[PDB]
């Protein structure tokens, strides 16, 4: 059972701007997704301060970066609070309509695309480098779900049959053909050190055979 939804108009415009504006500094997508993962980890940590059972679904709080050159995918995994089906609809737990409006105003006042994360819609910077994005997520209060979109105005949500995650979020970036530099170990390391060296969770960069 696959459900197909239309993006709200303003989110569709945000995605079209990210895809179609000439902007060479694409590497910021990874900073934004790691920052989102840190935010999600902070949330489950905070809930666990008063209810330890919130970590029955997994005590480890971490971020994994998994490149796969055969699949041409970069996957960012975190064991944060995850998202309910309702959160996945409703723009992956963001205030994306008002955030996009504020981001648009800033761009017209001289800001650039790299400020996107200050407006709460940093997730959509994934489309700087990905032709399709798959989000697998498990929240303590819901079942495991998969969100997917190749932009073009729509996304899908289905129950995830795949590997159980326990708790957290997996962002799978299906990279554009000309953006495979983001599968190279030395490139990922360089970006993580430049933008995320002080993240307060362990970031493990997986290697390949
Ligand atoms: C914005 N809150 C999350 C967060 C925390 C630490 C962090 O680390 C670095 C590393 C290099 C330069 C700047 N910040 C990056 C993001």
Curated annotation (Swiss-Prot):
* Superkingdom as given in the UniProt entry: Eukaryota
Q: How is it modified after translation?
A: ISGylated.
- For the ligand (ATP), the binding residues are 36, 78, 97, 123
Outcome of substituting residue 82 to D: Abolishes ATPase activity
Q: Where in the cell is it found?
A: Nucleus; Cytoplasm; Melanosome; Cell membrane
Q: Which positions does the record annotate as the modified residue N6-acetyllysine?
A: 43, 69
Task: Give me the ranges of the annotated region Interaction with NR3C1.
Answer: 1-209
- Disulfide linkages recorded for this protein, renumbered to the chain, are none
Domain remark from Swiss-Prot or TrEMBL: The TPR repeat-binding motif mediates interaction with TPR repeat-containing proteins like the co-chaperone STUB1.
Biological role: Molecular chaperone that promotes the maturation, structural maintenance and proper regulation of specific target proteins involved for instance in cell cycle control and signal transduction. Undergoes a functional cycle that is linked to its ATPase activity which is essential for its chaperone activity. This cycle probably induces conformational changes in the client proteins, thereby causing their activation. Interacts dynamically with various co-chaperones that modulate its substrate recognition, ATPase cycle and chaperone function. (Microbial infection) Seems to interfere with N.meningitidis NadA-mediated invasion of human cells. Decreasing HSP90 levels increases adhesion and entry of E.coli expressing NadA into human Chang cells; increasing its levels leads to decreased adhesion and invasion.
- What family classification does the UniProt entry report for this protein? Belongs to the heat shock protein 90 family.
Assembly with partners or alone: Homodimer. Identified in NR3C1/GCR steroid receptor-chaperone complexes formed at least by NR3C1, HSP90AA1 and a variety of proteins containing TPR repeats such as FKBP4, FKBP5, PPID, PPP5C or STIP1. Forms a complex containing HSP90AA1, TSC1 and TSC2; TSC1 is required to recruit TCS2 to the complex. The closed form interacts (via the middle domain and TPR repeat-binding motif) with co-chaperone TSC1 (via C-terminus). Interacts with TOM34. Interacts with TERT; the interaction, together with PTGES3, is required for correct assembly and stabilization of the TERT holoenzyme complex.
Q: What is this protein called?
A: Heat shock protein HSP 90-alpha
Q: What is the lineage of its organism?
A: Eukaryota, Metazoa, Chordata, Craniata, Vertebrata
Q: Which residues of the full protein are shown?
A: 16 to 224 of 732
């Amino acid at each position: 059972e696959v459900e197909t939804f239309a993006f709200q108009a303003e989110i569709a415009q945000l995605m079209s701007l990210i895809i179609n504006t000439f902007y060479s500094n694409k590497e910021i997508f990874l900073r934004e997704l790691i920052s989102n993962s840190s935010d999600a980890l902070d949330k489950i940590r905070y809930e666990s301060l008063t209810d330890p059972s919130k970590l029955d679904s997994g005590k480890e709080l971490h971020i994994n970066l998994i490149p796969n050159k055969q699949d041409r995918t970069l996957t960012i995994v975190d064991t944060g609070i995850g998202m309910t089906k309702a959160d996945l609809i409703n723009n992956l737990g963001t205030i994306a309509k008002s955030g996009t409006k504020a981001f648009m105003e800033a761009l017209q006042a001289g800001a650039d695309i790299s400020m996107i994360g200050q407006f709460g819609v940093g997730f959509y910077s994934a489309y700087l480098v990905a032709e399709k994005v798959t989000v697998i997520t498990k929240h303590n209060d819901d079942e495991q779900y998969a969100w997917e979109s190749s932009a073009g105005g729509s996304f899908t949500v289905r129950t995830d049959t795949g590997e159980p995650m326990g708790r957290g979020t997996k962002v799978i970036l299906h990279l554009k053909e000309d953006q495979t530099e983001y599968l190279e170990e030395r490139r990922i390391k360089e970006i993580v050190k430049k933008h995320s060296q002080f993240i307060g969770y362990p970031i493990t960069l997986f290697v390949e055979k």
